[PDB]
Coordinates of C-alpha atoms and ligand atoms in Angstrom, one line a residue:
Chain A
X1 CA -9.1 61.6 -41.4
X2 CA -9.7 58.4 -39.4
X3 CA -9.2 59.6 -35.8
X4 CA -6.5 58.1 -33.6
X5 CA -8.0 56.0 -30.9
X6 CA -5.0 56.3 -28.4
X7 CA -6.2 53.9 -25.8
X8 CA -4.1 50.9 -24.7
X9 CA -5.8 47.5 -25.0
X10 CA -7.3 46.3 -21.7
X11 CA -4.4 45.4 -19.4
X12 CA -4.9 41.7 -18.7
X13 CA -2.8 38.8 -20.0
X14 CA -4.0 35.2 -19.9
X15 CA -1.8 32.1 -19.5
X16 CA -2.4 28.5 -18.7
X17 CA -0.3 26.8 -16.0
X18 CA -1.2 23.2 -16.1
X19 CA -4.9 23.0 -15.1
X20 CA -4.8 26.5 -13.6
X21 CA -5.6 29.8 -15.4
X22 CA -3.3 32.8 -14.7
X23 CA -4.3 36.4 -15.5
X24 CA -1.7 39.1 -15.1
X25 CA -3.7 42.3 -14.3
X26 CA -2.2 45.6 -15.0
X27 CA -2.7 48.5 -12.5
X28 CA -1.1 50.8 -15.0
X29 CA 2.4 52.3 -15.0
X30 CA 4.2 55.0 -13.1
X31 CA 7.4 56.9 -13.8
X32 CA 10.1 56.1 -11.1
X33 CA 13.4 57.9 -10.3
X34 CA 15.1 54.5 -10.2
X35 CA 18.6 56.0 -10.4
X36 CA 18.0 57.8 -7.0
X37 CA 16.5 54.6 -5.4
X38 CA 19.2 52.1 -6.4
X39 CA 22.2 51.8 -4.0
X40 CA 24.8 52.5 -6.7
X41 CA 26.1 55.6 -8.5
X42 CA 23.3 57.2 -10.6
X43 CA 25.5 57.2 -13.8
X44 CA 25.9 53.4 -13.4
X45 CA 22.2 52.9 -13.2
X46 CA 21.9 55.5 -16.1
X47 CA 24.1 53.3 -18.3
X48 CA 22.4 50.0 -17.5
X49 CA 19.0 51.6 -18.3
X50 CA 20.4 52.9 -21.6
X51 CA 21.8 49.5 -22.5
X52 CA 18.1 48.3 -22.4
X53 CA 17.0 51.5 -24.1
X54 CA 15.5 53.2 -21.0
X55 CA 16.5 56.4 -19.3
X56 CA 15.5 59.3 -16.9
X57 CA 12.6 58.4 -14.6
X58 CA 11.6 55.0 -15.8
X59 CA 8.0 54.1 -16.7
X60 CA 7.4 51.1 -14.5
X61 CA 4.5 48.6 -14.7
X62 CA 2.6 47.7 -11.5
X63 CA 0.9 44.3 -11.8
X64 CA -1.2 41.8 -9.7
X65 CA -1.8 38.2 -10.6
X66 CA -5.1 36.4 -10.7
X67 CA -5.0 32.6 -10.3
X68 CA -8.1 30.5 -11.0
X69 CA -7.4 27.0 -9.7
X70 CA -10.7 25.7 -10.9
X71 CA -12.1 25.7 -7.4
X72 CA -10.8 29.1 -5.9
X73 CA -10.2 32.5 -7.4
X74 CA -7.2 34.1 -5.8
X75 CA -5.6 37.5 -6.5
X76 CA -2.0 38.1 -5.6
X77 CA -1.5 41.9 -5.0
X78 CA -4.0 44.6 -5.8
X79 CA -2.1 47.6 -7.3
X80 CA -2.3 51.0 -5.8
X81 CA -5.9 52.2 -6.3
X82 CA -5.5 56.0 -5.8
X83 CA -2.7 55.9 -3.2
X84 CA 0.2 56.4 -5.6
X85 CA -0.9 59.0 -8.1
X86 CA -3.4 59.2 -11.0
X87 CA -1.6 56.9 -13.4
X88 CA -2.3 53.8 -11.3
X89 CA -5.4 52.1 -9.9
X90 CA -6.4 50.3 -13.1
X91 CA -6.4 46.8 -11.7
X92 CA -10.1 46.9 -10.8
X93 CA -11.2 47.8 -14.4
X94 CA -8.8 45.2 -15.9
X95 CA -10.1 42.5 -13.5
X96 CA -13.6 43.2 -14.9
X97 CA -12.3 43.4 -18.5
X98 CA -10.7 40.0 -18.0
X99 CA -14.2 38.6 -17.4
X100 CA -14.3 38.4 -13.5
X101 CA -16.0 40.4 -10.9
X102 CA -14.3 41.6 -7.7
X103 CA -17.0 39.9 -5.6
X104 CA -15.9 36.6 -7.2
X105 CA -12.5 36.6 -5.5
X106 CA -12.2 34.1 -2.8
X107 CA -8.8 35.1 -1.4
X108 CA -6.3 38.0 -1.8
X109 CA -2.6 37.2 -1.0
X110 CA -0.2 40.1 -0.5
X111 CA 3.5 39.8 -1.3
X112 CA 4.0 42.8 1.0
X113 CA 2.1 45.9 2.1
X114 CA 3.8 48.7 0.1
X115 CA 1.0 51.0 -1.3
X116 CA 1.3 49.8 -4.9
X117 CA 0.3 46.3 -3.7
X118 CA -2.4 46.9 -1.1
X119 CA -4.1 50.1 -2.4
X120 CA -6.5 48.0 -4.5
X121 CA -8.0 46.4 -1.4
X122 CA -10.4 49.4 -1.0
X123 CA -12.7 51.4 -3.2
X124 CA -13.5 54.5 -1.1
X125 CA -14.6 53.3 2.3
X126 CA -15.9 50.0 0.9
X127 CA -14.1 46.6 0.6
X128 CA -13.0 46.1 -3.0
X129 CA -13.1 42.3 -2.5
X130 CA -16.0 41.9 0.0
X131 CA -16.1 38.1 -0.4
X132 CA -12.4 37.4 0.1
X133 CA -10.1 36.6 3.0
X134 CA -6.8 38.5 2.8
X135 CA -3.6 36.6 3.7
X136 CA -0.1 37.9 4.3
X137 CA 2.8 37.0 6.5
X138 CA 2.4 37.8 10.2
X139 CA 5.6 39.7 10.2
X140 CA 4.4 42.0 7.4
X141 CA 1.2 42.8 9.2
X142 CA 2.9 43.3 12.5
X143 CA 5.3 45.8 11.1
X144 CA 3.1 47.8 8.8
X145 CA -0.1 48.0 10.9
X146 CA 1.7 49.1 14.0
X147 CA 0.6 52.5 15.3
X148 CA 3.8 52.9 17.2
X149 CA 5.9 52.3 14.1
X150 CA 3.8 54.9 12.3
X151 CA 4.1 57.6 15.0
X152 CA 7.9 57.0 15.1
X153 CA 8.4 57.1 11.3
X154 CA 11.0 59.8 10.5
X155 CA 9.3 61.5 7.4
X156 CA 6.0 62.0 5.7
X157 CA 6.8 59.5 2.9
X158 CA 7.5 56.7 5.5
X159 CA 4.5 57.7 7.5
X160 CA 2.4 57.5 4.3
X161 CA 3.5 53.9 3.7
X162 CA 2.2 53.0 7.2
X163 CA -1.0 55.0 6.7
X164 CA -1.6 53.4 3.3
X165 CA -1.2 49.9 4.7
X166 CA -3.6 50.7 7.6
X167 CA -6.2 52.3 5.4
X168 CA -6.0 49.3 3.0
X169 CA -6.0 46.4 5.5
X170 CA -7.5 47.5 8.8
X171 CA -11.1 47.4 7.3
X172 CA -10.5 43.7 6.6
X173 CA -8.8 43.1 10.0
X174 CA -11.8 44.7 11.7
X175 CA -14.2 42.7 9.6
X176 CA -12.6 39.4 10.6
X177 CA -11.3 38.8 7.1
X178 CA -7.5 38.9 7.6
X179 CA -5.9 35.5 8.0
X180 CA -2.1 35.7 8.4
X181 CA 0.4 32.9 8.0
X182 CA 4.0 32.6 9.1
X183 CA 6.8 31.6 6.8
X184 CA 6.5 28.7 4.3
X185 CA 2.8 27.7 4.3
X186 CA 0.3 25.8 2.2
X187 CA -2.5 28.1 1.2
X188 CA -5.3 27.3 -1.2
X189 CA -4.6 23.9 -2.9
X190 CA -2.2 24.8 -5.7
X191 CA -0.6 27.9 -4.1
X192 CA 2.0 28.1 -1.3
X193 CA 3.6 31.0 0.6
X194 CA 7.4 31.0 0.4
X195 CA 9.3 33.3 2.8
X196 CA 11.4 35.8 1.0
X197 CA 11.9 38.5 3.6
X198 CA 14.1 41.6 3.2
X199 CA 12.4 44.0 0.8
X200 CA 10.0 44.2 3.8
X201 CA 10.0 42.3 7.0
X202 CA 7.3 39.9 5.8
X203 CA 7.8 39.9 2.0
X204 CA 6.4 36.7 0.5
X205 CA 6.7 34.8 -2.7
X206 CA 3.6 32.9 -3.9
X207 CA 4.4 29.6 -5.7
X208 CA 1.7 28.3 -8.0
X209 CA 1.9 24.6 -9.1
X210 CA -0.4 22.5 -11.3
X211 CA 0.3 19.2 -13.1
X212 CA 4.1 19.8 -12.6
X213 CA 4.0 23.3 -14.0
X214 CA 5.5 25.9 -11.6
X215 CA 5.1 29.7 -11.4
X216 CA 6.9 31.7 -8.7
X217 CA 5.2 35.1 -8.1
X218 CA 8.2 37.1 -6.7
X219 CA 6.4 40.3 -5.7
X220 CA 9.2 42.9 -5.3
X221 CA 12.2 40.6 -5.1
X222 CA 13.3 42.5 -8.2
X223 CA 12.5 46.2 -8.9
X224 CA 14.6 47.3 -11.9
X225 CA 15.1 44.5 -14.5
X226 CA 17.7 46.5 -16.5
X227 CA 20.0 46.5 -13.4
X228 CA 19.2 43.6 -11.1
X229 CA 19.1 40.7 -13.5
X230 CA 22.7 41.4 -14.5
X231 CA 23.6 42.4 -10.9
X232 CA 21.3 40.9 -8.3
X233 CA 23.5 42.5 -5.6
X234 CA 22.2 46.0 -6.2
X235 CA 19.6 47.0 -3.7
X236 CA 17.4 50.1 -3.0
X237 CA 16.7 52.5 -0.2
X238 CA 13.2 51.0 -0.1
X239 CA 14.5 47.6 1.0
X240 CA 14.1 47.0 4.8
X241 CA 17.1 44.7 4.9
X242 CA 19.5 45.1 1.9
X243 CA 21.7 42.1 2.6
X244 CA 18.6 39.9 3.1
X245 CA 17.0 41.0 -0.1
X246 CA 20.2 40.3 -2.1
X247 CA 20.4 36.8 -0.6
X248 CA 16.8 36.0 -1.3
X249 CA 16.9 37.5 -4.8
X250 CA 20.0 35.4 -5.7
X251 CA 18.3 32.4 -4.2
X252 CA 15.1 32.8 -6.3
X253 CA 17.1 33.5 -9.5
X254 CA 19.4 30.5 -9.1
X255 CA 16.5 28.2 -8.2
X256 CA 14.3 29.4 -11.1
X257 CA 17.2 29.0 -13.6
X258 CA 18.0 25.5 -12.3
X259 CA 14.4 24.3 -12.4
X260 CA 13.5 26.1 -15.6
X261 CA 10.1 27.4 -14.4
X262 CA 8.3 30.6 -14.9
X263 CA 8.7 33.6 -12.6
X264 CA 6.7 36.8 -12.4
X265 CA 7.3 40.1 -10.6
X266 CA 5.1 43.1 -10.0
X267 CA 7.4 45.6 -11.7
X268 CA 8.7 43.7 -14.6
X269 CA 7.3 45.1 -17.9
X270 CA 3.7 44.0 -18.0
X271 CA 2.7 41.1 -18.0
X272 CA 6.0 40.5 -16.2
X273 CA 6.1 36.7 -16.7
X274 CA 9.0 34.7 -18.1
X275 CA 11.9 32.3 -17.5
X276 CA 15.4 33.0 -16.2
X277 CA 18.7 31.7 -17.4
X278 CA 22.1 32.2 -15.7
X279 CA 24.2 34.4 -18.0
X280 CA 27.6 35.8 -17.5
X281 CA 27.8 37.6 -14.1
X282 CA 24.1 37.3 -13.4
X283 CA 20.9 36.3 -15.1
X284 CA 18.9 36.9 -18.3
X285 CA 15.1 37.2 -18.2
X286 CA 13.2 35.5 -21.0
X287 CA 9.7 36.8 -21.4
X288 CA 7.0 34.1 -21.9
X289 CA 6.3 33.3 -25.5
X290 CA 2.9 34.7 -26.5
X291 CA 0.4 31.9 -26.5
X292 CA -3.3 32.0 -27.3
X293 CA -5.5 30.5 -24.6
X294 CA -8.7 28.9 -25.8
Chain B
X1 CA -14.6 30.2 -7.2
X2 CA -15.2 30.8 -11.0
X3 CA -15.1 28.6 -14.1
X4 CA -12.0 29.4 -16.0
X5 CA -12.4 31.9 -18.7
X6 CA -9.4 30.7 -20.7
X7 CA -9.8 33.5 -23.3
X8 CA -6.8 35.6 -24.3
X9 CA -7.0 39.4 -24.2
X10 CA -7.8 41.0 -27.6
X11 CA -4.8 40.8 -29.9
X12 CA -4.0 44.4 -30.3
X13 CA -1.1 46.4 -28.8
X14 CA -1.0 50.2 -28.9
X15 CA 2.2 52.2 -29.1
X16 CA 3.0 55.9 -29.8
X17 CA 5.8 56.7 -32.3
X18 CA 6.3 60.5 -32.3
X19 CA 2.9 61.8 -33.6
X20 CA 1.9 58.5 -35.2
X21 CA -0.2 55.8 -33.6
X22 CA 1.0 52.2 -34.1
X23 CA -1.2 49.2 -33.4
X24 CA 0.2 45.7 -33.6
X25 CA -2.7 43.5 -34.7
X26 CA -2.5 39.8 -33.9
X27 CA -3.7 37.3 -36.5
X28 CA -3.4 34.5 -34.0
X29 CA -0.6 32.0 -33.6
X30 CA 0.3 28.7 -35.4
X31 CA 2.6 25.8 -34.4
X32 CA 5.5 25.5 -36.8
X33 CA 8.1 22.6 -37.2
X34 CA 11.0 25.1 -37.1
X35 CA 13.4 22.2 -36.7
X36 CA 12.5 20.8 -40.1
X37 CA 12.4 24.2 -41.9
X38 CA 15.7 25.9 -40.6
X39 CA 18.8 25.1 -42.8
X40 CA 20.9 23.7 -40.0
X41 CA 21.2 20.4 -38.1
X42 CA 18.3 19.6 -35.8
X43 CA 20.6 19.2 -32.8
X44 CA 21.5 22.9 -33.2
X45 CA 17.8 24.0 -33.4
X46 CA 16.7 21.9 -30.4
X47 CA 19.6 23.3 -28.4
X48 CA 18.6 26.9 -29.3
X49 CA 15.0 26.4 -28.6
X50 CA 15.7 24.8 -25.2
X51 CA 18.0 27.7 -24.4
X52 CA 15.0 30.0 -24.9
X53 CA 12.8 27.4 -22.9
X54 CA 11.0 26.5 -26.1
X55 CA 10.2 23.0 -27.5
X56 CA 10.0 22.2 -31.3
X57 CA 6.4 22.8 -32.7
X58 CA 7.1 26.5 -32.0
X59 CA 3.8 28.3 -31.3
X60 CA 4.6 31.2 -33.7
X61 CA 2.6 34.4 -33.7
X62 CA 1.5 36.1 -37.0
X63 CA 1.2 39.9 -36.7
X64 CA 0.2 42.9 -38.9
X65 CA 0.9 46.6 -38.0
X66 CA -1.5 49.5 -38.3
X67 CA -0.1 53.0 -38.7
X68 CA -2.3 56.0 -38.1
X69 CA -0.2 59.0 -39.2
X70 CA -3.1 61.3 -38.2
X71 CA -3.9 61.9 -41.9
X72 CA -3.8 58.3 -43.3
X73 CA -4.6 54.9 -42.0
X74 CA -2.1 52.3 -43.3
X75 CA -1.9 48.6 -42.6
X76 CA 1.3 46.6 -43.1
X77 CA 0.5 42.9 -43.8
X78 CA -2.9 41.4 -43.2
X79 CA -2.5 37.9 -41.7
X80 CA -3.7 34.7 -43.3
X81 CA -7.5 34.9 -43.1
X82 CA -8.5 31.3 -43.8
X83 CA -5.5 30.4 -45.9
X84 CA -3.4 28.8 -43.2
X85 CA -5.6 26.9 -40.8
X86 CA -8.2 27.6 -38.1
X87 CA -5.9 29.2 -35.6
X88 CA -5.2 32.3 -37.8
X89 CA -7.4 34.9 -39.4
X90 CA -7.9 36.9 -36.2
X91 CA -6.6 40.2 -37.7
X92 CA -10.0 41.5 -39.0
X93 CA -11.7 41.2 -35.6
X94 CA -8.7 42.6 -33.8
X95 CA -8.6 45.7 -36.1
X96 CA -12.1 46.2 -35.0
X97 CA -11.2 45.7 -31.3
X98 CA -8.5 48.3 -31.9
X99 CA -11.2 50.9 -32.6
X100 CA -11.1 50.9 -36.4
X101 CA -13.2 49.6 -39.3
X102 CA -11.7 48.0 -42.4
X103 CA -13.4 50.7 -44.5
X104 CA -11.1 53.2 -42.8
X105 CA -7.9 51.7 -44.1
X106 CA -6.5 54.0 -46.9
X107 CA -3.5 51.9 -48.0
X108 CA -2.2 48.3 -47.4
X109 CA 1.5 47.6 -47.6
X110 CA 2.7 44.1 -48.1
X111 CA 6.2 43.0 -46.9
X112 CA 5.7 40.0 -49.2
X113 CA 3.0 37.7 -50.5
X114 CA 3.2 34.5 -48.4
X115 CA -0.3 33.4 -47.3
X116 CA 0.0 34.6 -43.7
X117 CA 0.6 38.1 -44.9
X118 CA -1.8 38.4 -47.9
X119 CA -4.7 36.2 -46.8
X120 CA -6.5 39.0 -44.9
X121 CA -6.9 41.1 -48.1
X122 CA -10.1 39.1 -48.8
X123 CA -13.0 38.2 -46.5
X124 CA -15.3 35.6 -48.0
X125 CA -14.5 36.1 -51.7
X126 CA -14.9 39.9 -51.2
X127 CA -12.6 42.8 -50.6
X128 CA -11.6 43.3 -46.9
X129 CA -10.3 46.9 -47.3
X130 CA -12.8 48.3 -49.9
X131 CA -11.3 51.8 -49.8
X132 CA -7.6 50.9 -49.8
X133 CA -4.9 50.9 -52.4
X134 CA -2.6 47.9 -52.1
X135 CA 1.2 48.4 -52.5
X136 CA 4.0 45.9 -52.9
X137 CA 7.3 45.6 -54.7
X138 CA 7.0 44.9 -58.5
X139 CA 9.3 41.9 -58.1
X140 CA 7.0 40.5 -55.5
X141 CA 3.8 40.8 -57.6
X142 CA 5.6 39.7 -60.8
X143 CA 6.8 36.5 -59.1
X144 CA 3.8 35.4 -57.1
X145 CA 1.1 36.5 -59.7
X146 CA 2.7 34.6 -62.5
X147 CA 0.4 31.9 -63.8
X148 CA 3.4 30.1 -65.2
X149 CA 5.3 30.0 -61.9
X150 CA 2.1 28.5 -60.5
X151 CA 1.9 25.8 -63.2
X152 CA 5.7 25.4 -62.9
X153 CA 5.9 25.1 -59.1
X154 CA 7.5 21.9 -57.8
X155 CA 5.3 20.9 -54.8
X156 CA 1.8 21.7 -53.9
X157 CA 3.0 23.8 -50.9
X158 CA 4.4 26.3 -53.3
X159 CA 1.4 25.9 -55.6
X160 CA -0.8 26.9 -52.6
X161 CA 1.4 29.9 -52.1
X162 CA 0.9 31.1 -55.6
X163 CA -2.9 30.4 -55.5
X164 CA -3.2 32.2 -52.2
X165 CA -1.4 35.3 -53.5
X166 CA -3.5 35.3 -56.7
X167 CA -6.8 34.8 -54.8
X168 CA -5.8 37.6 -52.4
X169 CA -4.4 40.3 -54.7
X170 CA -6.0 39.8 -58.2
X171 CA -9.4 41.2 -56.9
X172 CA -7.6 44.4 -56.1
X173 CA -5.6 44.3 -59.4
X174 CA -8.9 44.1 -61.3
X175 CA -10.4 46.9 -59.3
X176 CA -7.5 49.2 -60.2
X177 CA -6.2 49.2 -56.6
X178 CA -2.8 47.5 -56.8
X179 CA -0.1 50.1 -57.1
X180 CA 3.4 48.5 -57.1
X181 CA 6.7 50.2 -56.3
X182 CA 10.3 49.3 -57.2
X183 CA 12.9 49.1 -54.5
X184 CA 13.4 52.0 -52.1
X185 CA 10.3 54.2 -52.4
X186 CA 8.9 57.1 -50.5
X187 CA 5.2 56.1 -49.8
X188 CA 2.8 58.1 -47.7
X189 CA 4.7 60.9 -45.8
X190 CA 6.3 59.1 -42.8
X191 CA 6.5 55.6 -44.4
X192 CA 9.2 54.4 -46.8
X193 CA 9.7 51.2 -48.6
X194 CA 13.2 49.7 -48.1
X195 CA 14.2 46.8 -50.3
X196 CA 15.1 43.7 -48.2
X197 CA 14.9 41.1 -51.0
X198 CA 15.6 37.5 -50.5
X199 CA 13.1 35.8 -48.2
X200 CA 10.9 36.5 -51.3
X201 CA 12.1 38.1 -54.6
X202 CA 10.5 41.4 -53.6
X203 CA 10.4 41.2 -49.8
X204 CA 10.2 44.8 -48.5
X205 CA 10.8 46.5 -45.1
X206 CA 8.6 49.5 -44.2
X207 CA 10.3 52.2 -42.3
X208 CA 8.0 54.4 -40.3
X209 CA 9.2 57.7 -38.9
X210 CA 7.6 60.6 -37.0
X211 CA 9.3 63.5 -35.2
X212 CA 12.6 61.6 -35.4
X213 CA 11.3 58.3 -33.8
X214 CA 11.8 55.4 -36.2
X215 CA 10.3 51.9 -36.4
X216 CA 11.4 49.4 -39.0
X217 CA 8.8 46.8 -40.0
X218 CA 11.0 43.9 -41.0
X219 CA 8.3 41.5 -42.2
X220 CA 9.9 38.1 -42.4
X221 CA 13.6 39.1 -42.2
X222 CA 13.6 36.9 -39.0
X223 CA 11.4 33.8 -38.5
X224 CA 12.8 32.1 -35.4
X225 CA 14.0 34.5 -32.7
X226 CA 15.5 31.7 -30.6
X227 CA 17.9 30.9 -33.4
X228 CA 18.4 33.8 -35.7
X229 CA 19.1 36.6 -33.3
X230 CA 22.2 34.7 -31.9
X231 CA 23.0 33.4 -35.5
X232 CA 21.6 35.7 -38.2
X233 CA 23.3 33.5 -40.8
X234 CA 20.9 30.6 -40.3
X235 CA 18.2 30.5 -43.1
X236 CA 15.2 28.4 -43.9
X237 CA 13.9 26.4 -46.8
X238 CA 11.2 29.0 -47.1
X239 CA 13.8 31.7 -48.1
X240 CA 14.0 32.3 -51.9
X241 CA 17.6 33.4 -51.7
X242 CA 19.5 32.2 -48.6
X243 CA 22.6 34.4 -49.2
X244 CA 20.4 37.5 -49.8
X245 CA 18.3 36.9 -46.7
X246 CA 21.4 36.4 -44.6
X247 CA 22.9 39.7 -45.9
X248 CA 19.7 41.7 -45.5
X249 CA 18.9 40.4 -42.0
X250 CA 22.5 41.2 -40.8
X251 CA 22.2 44.7 -42.4
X252 CA 18.8 45.4 -40.7
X253 CA 20.2 44.2 -37.3
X254 CA 23.4 46.1 -37.6
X255 CA 21.5 49.3 -38.6
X256 CA 18.9 49.1 -35.8
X257 CA 21.6 48.3 -33.2
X258 CA 23.6 51.3 -34.5
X259 CA 20.6 53.6 -34.6
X260 CA 18.9 52.3 -31.5
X261 CA 15.5 52.5 -33.1
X262 CA 12.6 50.0 -32.8
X263 CA 12.0 47.1 -35.1
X264 CA 9.0 44.8 -35.5
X265 CA 8.7 41.5 -37.2
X266 CA 5.6 39.4 -38.2
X267 CA 6.7 36.3 -36.3
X268 CA 8.4 37.6 -33.2
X269 CA 6.3 36.9 -30.1
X270 CA 3.3 39.2 -30.3
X271 CA 3.4 42.2 -30.4
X272 CA 6.8 41.6 -31.9
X273 CA 8.2 45.2 -31.3
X274 CA 11.5 46.0 -29.6
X275 CA 15.1 47.2 -29.9
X276 CA 18.2 45.3 -30.9
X277 CA 21.7 45.4 -29.7
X278 CA 24.9 43.7 -30.7
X279 CA 25.9 40.8 -28.5
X280 CA 28.7 38.5 -29.3
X281 CA 28.6 37.0 -32.9
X282 CA 25.0 38.1 -33.0
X283 CA 22.3 40.2 -31.4
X284 CA 19.9 40.3 -28.4
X285 CA 16.2 41.5 -28.9
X286 CA 14.9 43.8 -26.2
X287 CA 11.1 43.8 -26.2
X288 CA 9.7 47.3 -26.0
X289 CA 8.9 48.5 -22.4
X290 CA 5.2 48.3 -21.7
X291 CA 3.7 51.8 -21.9
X292 CA 0.2 53.1 -21.3
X293 CA -1.3 55.1 -24.2
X294 CA -4.1 57.6 -23.3
Ligands
LIG1 ZN1 7.7 47.3 -2.7
LIG2 ZN1 6.1 47.6 -5.5
LIG3 ZN1 7.2 34.5 -45.2
LIG4 ZN1 5.3 34.9 -42.7

């Protein structure tokens, strides 16, 4: 007779990294036809999913990462807001439930400008982080914010990716709040941009370092853990440069396994944080041990 | 900027299982000298922990599991309250964060009577679940509630175990609220007791099943994931019967890998829920995919 509550706990996850505080912020999840996206036979993807006890369209987390360096509050990726269906757009509420207000964010860094990463930049026609400067790679902005690329896009879904980027960033560009970088660049003390182009022309990894503790925020360098850890060579039809993304993925996996530091990625099962170990033909992902933060 | 919150999310995790609602409830974490407790050379244990990127004082979570069948509210294990140091005892508050009150709990099932599972039966020196019947195996109660085993215990660590169990259950015994079972027993519709004796003389697994979806609450059949998934035969000095616990753990692992259903265990990294598959001489735990519950 006790009612079922049936609400997930607030989607934020707290982790110390040296003297910095990290908060994975969930935007929700969305079901993706990953077998149709991956560049390999659908039964092969089907089987890899089933080995990890997944199938059919796959419920995929969408996550952004809040870094409090003690002097700046930085958000890496912003979820989708309302751009990508009604199951997403939760990052704003989870930012507040994690004890921060959007106005308190100093900078927003974008791994890339796909809709599930930039949508959160806007709430209606108002800036969602009115106090922040938005940073991403020059090559990312130059590709996605190009009117000519939009009008030449050969389908409504592609056009929609361009429109979503424009609707999400151009308010900041026009307000003088967009500050691009090019390639490997020191950002806020404690965070650097690391070029990992190929999923998109300007796709960027954000590397957080404090007191010798490292965390590489890989954005969309990996999209389907149950396939691409074992086989980092499998790509998707959403990658701008397949061979580049395979190179940059293998690079990040080998470097993280050698150094033994944490990685995170937007679409690993929330909170999406853990270590990586070279195993057999590929890699094994080891989710971070639950730790209470006081 | 912002001052760092450094406060973890509430320790509850919501998961649907058929028509039932499951809530993993965190009691906190505690650092354990697993290298001194496991029955194997320390070189082996350091190796395994480092393989999983872990050190030695393993920060170990302590979890209880709430089952709302829609008709009954059942709690499986209760954390340590104040019996096992100041980092545990979070379960009461996290049950409340999960949308429930202690008065709503109809039945409490104990995998076994160690302090980090029975402590939460008592708040202050007063009943934490005033409307609940408490169930455990008869062998469990007969062993831990024995005044003579207390007075006969070799060390004061074991003496504390007996005293903790007495202090936690005897109030319910005197209120007429302890209803033991013996071995495999159909409890509340949807929940079965399965005998998994050997960590304790009456350690019991609780098998939850709704609309064909199964979840096996293993209690303490595994204590150190970084060791005992790859080598289920390794036991600890805390296990009453090492041969029995080896056999029962291997049986649970083989059965869940055959059946492909979910398991949960008290000291796997919170929430401690996932699938299991055979890998080599042992097994590889696959944490449940994050899913949003509405
Ligand atoms: Zn993307
Ligand atoms: Zn994405
Ligand atoms: Zn135990
Ligand atoms: Zn225990």
